[model samples]
Target: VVETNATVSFIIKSGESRAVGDDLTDAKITKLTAMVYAGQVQEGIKTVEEDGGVLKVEGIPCKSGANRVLVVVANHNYELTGKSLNEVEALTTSLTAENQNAKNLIMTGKSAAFTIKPGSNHYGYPGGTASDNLVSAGTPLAVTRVHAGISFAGVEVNMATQYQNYYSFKPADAKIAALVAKKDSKIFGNSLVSNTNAYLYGVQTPAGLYTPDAAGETYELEASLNTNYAVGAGFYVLESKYDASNELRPTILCIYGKLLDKDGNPLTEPALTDAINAGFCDGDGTTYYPVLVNYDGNGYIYSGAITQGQNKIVRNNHYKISLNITGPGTNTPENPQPVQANLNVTCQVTPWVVVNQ
Candidate 1:
């Protein structure tokens, strides 16, 4: 099979013969290997339908040294006009060379490892540097395991405050703790809401607002971001376990910010870095301010929580609003109980303009 000169070798399964390409036929091919015709090649961009999408790049062989892979978007649009792939589960995993011999930059969804090969191609193109010095032959990689979730309700999420306004309902303490355990998956910060209480909301009638007091209220709490298409919006708590109860649950906290791109799209990632660099970050990005009193937890700070007040939109413009849950407790080697869940969160701004004189 591995030789100096070979095109392909095939084995038949059942049928006699069949045409695959324009002028090619194989008899019930069971297995085959198409020898790679090495020659001049370049990187390419293949697009996927964005129901949350992924793209694959090929044409380059594995390893000249660590190959640099970069993903660039031409025109990406989200239901939330100002959001970008920078938010949500916007990361990738490698496609094993054995499986495809091509790097399958998995851009769809995790807490996984990625490998980079070395090359003088793909990473650079159109008369650019052969390779970025930042990448060594076998360099350590950076992985940001971003979890995401979607809340179906069209409820307005205010990142500047905790979920106190919706505190009328609560789930069992066990439930709260379980949900709290997932405070850090989706949006790269604490769960926008407090993990202090397990909260879920339902419709309100003239008689009263009602939430089901069942073991499955947690399921009810699980919702999606508002979207036009059948695709649900998402948030990432990312992980699990506990009995459910019907105490009035605490409302989930929402992150805040109002900075838009020059084109006017809101951010999917934290705007803090840019905002700070622009000297607009309200605080030192660490000092948490209080958005809602008695909430105990402070309002968004620069580091993780990005929040804004009514008059400080421009001041907050450089910040990115986060939408993740805080893990119940610090994770250490001894107590390795990581959070687990399919919950997802998407970042979207309702377009509010609060002017302060």
Candidate 2:
């Protein structure tokens, strides 16, 4: 992610549920992962640690209430681009609110409240109207198939900023052009860790389409990057896909996931955190790998651009490449940093993990 975010202190008591930060400097957390305190895996963790009462380092804060936390995820693109990590981190708070709106879309009897946890690299939460019609991660049976309202739980996985300009998978044209040139062939993402080495490559959900009589809509789901991102579940961005009967019948779940490290670090780079991260994220997801083609905003996508995310990346030898500012056939930066050559990015993968029963 942005490698930002300072120590945060939030309460999980009877009423209060806000995570406050002691310092916003370099506190741009792109991923907010969560894991229940099963046995001894997760113990007496504090928001901020204590080193002789001065200040130590730790994970997100909680007060031992329901234990449902709000793991805030920020954007690396904005953070490293001179944007405030706090501003990006604020997205996590906003995500907390969006998750609630999605909850209303669920008419089931289960509490789909989101829980924030630390990631192998960062932390994250769920958002949007979670899918009630679709299946869960490990359920071998059908939970429910109602697609009337949104399933909020699934939305939390889409931590990308809805505000496309400042926060999204895509950014400015100058930025976009600059990005594609960096990846030459590969990009790095450290928010997740896995030895599996399976990469979705890229994914992009095409824009919405406007229907005339029925006002038709299209919600495409892409899964090219699932191997490394470690996304829980995917959801199509729609206003509830169903028949005219108002039945809850979700069409698709859009997502991409990767495993995490023990220290909750991805060891890769976020789409926008840096040039290569931004380039590959936007390029592979948009023009090269597997692209998606539907969602719920105006029902009209950006045409060929949406499909281009993953359609353009062709494999030379199942290979990835490193990037720098002074390579041939690549777009050079305005003013390369003195240590630009010193910066190099590599991607690591883990095969799998063993969860206890």
Candidate 3:
């Protein structure tokens, strides 16, 4: 086999479609890096030059008929000059407000082994058909983000008709809690963390329901009720699995508000304090309370017949949650008790792009 240098290039296209409330335009790719590998050794690395959708990396030195693997990363500045394939795959990045936002999401993709020929060789992007002079499309190297998206679709206060005569509930504000925002995640492959090691952005305490650290890390809902208040700009988190036995639990949406009387007046202090102690309201007496949206009456989010505790939040998937508040919620934010059959919730999950098979 004769040794020679060849320019390897292909387009990086998104395998996901644009959905309502979760737009693909929001997650932009700012930078791209391509790495060429021969077996376990790193052969060549280049900063990819982009022209619209197509990406080009030139002057990759390799022997003719030698099989090479290609890996690409987007929006992350990792120094991969002398790293081996194993070292590259082992790299992990900590989740941060700076990197996980909608505009600067980190993404990765990889291609299977392809012969390095000496002539003009153009490979089709993943999921595209092969033509003459083009290598048969290898595994679809569809680049995907490292975090999952969560968007608020709005809330409703539809108290049961029978209970309306005795008690009236009005929601003033709503916030999401138990978010696994701070953690270490793999840059190339599936990165799952244990429940005990996961750090939450917002936690429930005796003083109040939610204690949040970051503003946008934990989503805050609009004050309006019973209207389509879907937030166009959604929040993001690393992939997390529901573990009933451990402290790391699935992400939850908490609604904070007041419990009113038959008339338009609010409940008294002692009664409001009792309600707050009972997990119905917050410490402020009138401002915030706790209701776990999507609470499956049991303790986990409802995901059909499958043991609800087994549900997992995957990376690059978009989740939209809408609430129907029929009654009061639990006091404990982290380990919420069984909520009343009052809360009806719906969560919509959509993938950003299907990963390579």
Candidate 4:
């Protein structure tokens, strides 16, 4: 008679309450892999991680029950990013946050460099030419995810500013063309670090969306550059997907403006203090009136899912804010500088932090 060999199997509960033993009989099965094969798949699920020798999964794909799970695991470990790093020095640090996990930064494009610790398995590179997400030298290619929290406890990673225009334009046509060109691709007016290697180190969010002054008035950045400059300075705010649920959302205050020569008629580049102070800020020495509304009256213009003081769901990669001169607004001075608005003076204060998709 011919003999046949049979294999044994076991079912693990959802939380994986039990783990395989390393007893004498377990020697043959030193590794275990948990996999899924749901023909009709859904995002954000069916992925698994192991903890304390047990297969674990989080979220709601399995609840749908349309997923096909199989016990086909192997010797593997999850490389938790934003956990520990030595990308620059020999110091090792563990991340600690109140309620959220840190984000993973994937170095890509032009060789972004970092010093990985001897044991931290978080960093990696998918080597090859045409390799899309690789960083070279000291450039930041991209992060695995964009963090939305205003204050995070972890490595100070560098981030780019929201896409907006920084160049002051002349002639309505020139301004329009500049704007359109920016929407198409990186133009001369682009103001984000996406095209260059810059400091993303410890980025502190703006003090508050609405920086109110002593008179409870909000101020705007109004420094004159050129008489041929665009209509007026524009100030903008954008939203992200996580905005809808933010309890302490952002808001805009007074639409203040300052100019060296209220009429934009200056012979030379004026000092910022003189621009808004003598001309627009201290209008008559009292009754702070820093708002510089164009003769058009509707000088304040904003685009995106924005509300008067709050915003709708904000998309991280999409929401943007632009502030500059759009039309002719007479320079009204002195709306009162925010407590933290004093030039060359202000401590690092983190906001409640806005979130986005």
Candidate 5:
């Protein structure tokens, strides 16, 4: 039962917006590919044309029954010309540094089973229509992005009064990096989390401290503890492997800063070196020390039992972190120990529209 002049129309919408101060350009759908499938067979595929916000794939020869699925992909140019439905379902996208740009996020969506009758059908628009067998998918297709986001909400400095007289810490720079983040992810199903081919961004090898890499692995930006609390256009990462014993690494935010004397002068050689040696400043023989955001004073993010989902970074979720500084951080970025009950890190998590399965 093929209808030669059938047109399938859909109302497509994006997932929820990011939090305030976050860039929304990453959510824009620059291109759309829609495919109609009957069982494992591909009935038709089209590059959808957008009018206002409505998407239409014109001239789809109608199939016989009601057991059809529509899969839509946005912003990713996947070569699906001769692929089967199973192949498309198993498709995975390899992520690179370029994919983290503001307007190039990959998103996917699928529709429930819908019938394509021989006659004309119009979905979404209710009034009246004529001619070329129009078929409407009825329900809106909601597409979601394939990555998670870590946003730096703000930071507050609350050092002990004794230390305040001799030193003042001000944030100079910050970088966010994911250790053991997946290099590839499934476009339509549960995210893939593996230690193999994982990326370690912003952190230096052997030392485990913050070091800007030229390989485009980390998100770095200038910061100021006094005025500019909001950091960079937040960092994006794929789902990472998580273990109960934390053998798998998680995402980390390393803040670099300087220590100043009470008289507004930079702490000099002897004072800086002494501070570093005495565990009062966690510096690497440099002017700045790395403050690990959300680090539990004792190296790990949490102290005891790690809740299954809450303790780990998963895909399609947004984590907003606030760092409350009480004193200086430990010297190393990897397993930092607070010097004086220093950091009080708080995090708020929300669906990057929805949760991880």
Candidate 6:
């Protein structure tokens, strides 16, 4: 509804000021948006069980063999106290405003999302994994296709605390390449852990798509700062077929990190940014995810969709995208030392798209 005037509004009441942290107390309001989009189709469907357990999205087609779009988590209790979400699926389609208008005209599937609110919003998953499935603190019930033209969208108060630890890519050689990626677990510069052969405890997955005996094999991989969630990605790849072995190859790097407590007890949540808050993220860990694009392939990074909506349909062609999350913020409270903190988000999305093939 393009109109003469528009206003950003929401119904917010004073809730738990100490819920997410101290900074955002007295029912703080968080709204993030973009003026335009780059026409990259970004969509995600998360598993919502009223209560917070394992928020998962299933049947996400593989984007490649090396990396996959694994689960991404935004929380103050990150790599420190609980399981960093895993099993994420990345997509190749794009979402845009121009295309959303077109969809309204034709009545295609509308990108939908759910929210998890605590104390106020009645949502509780009895069969949740976490005893304190505190996921109630407003979160996307399902994955969100965050496109452009999002003027005044209420972002999850804790979402800004997201970082990248993994990604998927097409292999360069079939004659030979490291099977699995290894994690050094230590912190590097801003680029923390880039390309290497260390299996992060939770950085990526024990997953890859290959033609059993083929020389070249394509695969998908996920990375992140913490051992659990992934915050970045690339395109798809055409891998060199698989060679040798009738058995598991340790050479096929998977992931590595400090062993867990076995009781499923999380160590502690870390800051999403490079400045790991010893108070927040107080443990050693790693994980993985599966992405849809091949970082090195021409098709790895596909076009996005129109995010703007009108009659329900979308418009636009497609766009090339580049995303970077500076990582979650860190703030120890004056009285309690914020158990967690949120970060600011930054995105550059090109706007355009093409519907009907």
Each model's lDDT = 0.22, 0.20, 0.53, 0.21, 0.53, 0.21
Candidate 6 on 56-78: residue-level lDDT in tens?
22222212111112232221111
Clash count, candidate 3: 2
* Model 2 per-residue lDDT tens digits across residues 1-357: 223222222211111212122110111112222222322123222222122221112343332322332222111111222223233222211111222122211100111333333431112112221232111222211111111111111112111233222222211111111011001111111111112211111133222221111233222222311222111211211121122222222122122222222232332345334433432223232211111122222121222223211212211101111111111111122212233221122211111111111
Sorted by TM-score (best first), the order is 3, 5, 4, 1, 2, 6
What is the RMSD, in Å, between candidate 1 and the native fold over all Cα?
A: 23.6
Backbone clashes in candidate 5 total 1
Query: What is the clash count for each candidate, in the order shown?
Result: 65, 96, 2, 40, 1, 147
Q: What C-alpha lDDT, on a 0 to 100 scale, does residue 156 get in candidate 5?
A: 66
- Evaluated against the true structure, the overall lDDT of model 2 is 0.20
How do the residues 1-357 of candidate 1 rate in per-residue lDDT, one tens digit apiece? 122211111111122222222110111111111111122121222332322211222332333322223322211222322223243323222112221111121111111112333332322122332442222222211112222222222222232233222111111110111112222112222222223223222211111112223344332223321112111221222311122224322223222222332333332235535444433222223111101101123332333233232211110111122333321111111111233311123323221111111
Residue 317, model 6, lDDT: 13
> Of the pair 2 and 5, which is ahead by lDDT?
5
- Looking at model 1, which ten-residue stretch has the lowest summed lDDT? 169-178
lDDT of 6: 0.21
Best by TM-score: 3
**TM-scores of the candidates in the order shown:** 0.20, 0.16, 0.73, 0.22, 0.71, 0.16
> What's the CA RMSD of model 4 in angstroms?
21.5
Residue ranges of candidate 5 with Cα displaced over 4 Å? 1-6, 14-19, 24-26, 49-62, 120-139, 172-180, 192-197, 205-232, 244-246, 259-266, 278-309, 336-341, 352-357
Tens digits of per-residue lDDT, candidate 4, 1-357, equal 122121111222222111122010110112333222233221111223333432222222222122222223222223322222222112111111211222121111111222221221111222331321222322212211111112101111111132111111122322110000000011111121121111110111123322223242223332211112132222112222112222222222122222222233332334334433433233311111122111112233333233231232211222222233332222322222333121111111112111111
User: Model 2 — TM-score against the truth?
Assistant: 0.16
Tell me the spans in candidate 3 whose CA falls farther than 4 Å from its real position: 1-4, 23-26, 49-65, 125-133, 138-140, 162-172, 177-182, 190-196, 203-233, 244-248, 257-266, 286-310, 339-341, 353-357
